[PDB]
Ligand binder design. Sequence first.
Ligand code: HEM
Ligand SMILES: [Ca+2]
Ligand SMILES: [Ca+2]
Length: 330
Amino acid sequence: ATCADGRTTANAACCVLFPILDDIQENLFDGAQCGEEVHESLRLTFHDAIGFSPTLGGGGADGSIITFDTIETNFPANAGIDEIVSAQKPFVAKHNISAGDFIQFAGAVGVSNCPGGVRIPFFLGRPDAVAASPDHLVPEPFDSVDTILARMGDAGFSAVEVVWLLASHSIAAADKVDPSIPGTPFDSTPGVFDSQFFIETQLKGRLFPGTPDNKGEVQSPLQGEIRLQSDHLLARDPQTACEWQSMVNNQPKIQNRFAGTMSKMALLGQDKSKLIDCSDIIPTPPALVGAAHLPAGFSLSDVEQACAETPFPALTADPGPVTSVPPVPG
Ligand code: HEM
Ligand SMILES: [Ca+2]
Ligand SMILES: [Ca+2]
């Protein structure tokens, strides 16, 4: 099909997405960069979608976090999500797709900007949100593994799927876990969708990058990197540790499982058969940059092996002395 903007797509209903793509690439993502706004937009996909429980209710990936922001903005786990909601609102107001569609579209487009990224399937047609999410459906970094897995499981995800979705933390930072050091990433390559997150979370902690005593934080192995308590525990818990380790230096697995599981997440509360497949609108991501490695100055003895069936793979360290990770600008 040929669209009003002159471009081609398989299903002509998807043409509406091309001007939206252009607008977000320029005016939300700072020229199609894998930076702060991409990261926040990706987090928003999860906070919107995970507000779904067959028991407790919630419409899932329905745009409620924007449309009912006056309610959802007050939820504890939504700390620091108000900035990206505020940034997305004028786009939702200005274009002609639902808020639920916009959130998932912006997330998929954003991931496609990141070197090593993957094209996440995208469907068009989510109805407008009808009610705010119930509170307390977003997992917290101070929740135990069993609590996190139970909540994610309630929404429909297996333990391995939780690990796959946490590849998102490869392109990610924290502003509120330790508010003294906003923009501190979870891996040494927050601009690259890669396995460094799965490697670096497996290292023995060494230091707090900022203040001590923050809820939901534990010691990190690197200055300028922050470690969530939840990620620390998920990397080591027998339910998840072998799957976590299996992501290390397996870029195709990270990509394919992230795409598939993100598609599932983007469809929480929705019925694929009542939507239109517009996956071909998502751009081709740049190739992976870099290769899997231990940080400079580290060795296998710094890895806390936690997979009972399989040893941690032999990686090479970057050359030189131990170095710090720069924060995400913004
Ligand atoms: C499984 C349980 C999870 C927990 C406990 C968790 C927790 C967190 C926390 C505490 C932050 C830092 C927020 C801040 O202080 O600014 C964060 C950031 C982030 N999370 Fe997760 N997360 C989880 C799952 C996910 C999933 C499934 C996604 C998928 C989209 C995701 C995507 C992100 C992204 C992209 C960021 C970076 C945001 C930024 O750079 O500002 N998280 N997560
Ligand atoms: Ca929602
Ligand atoms: Ca990374």
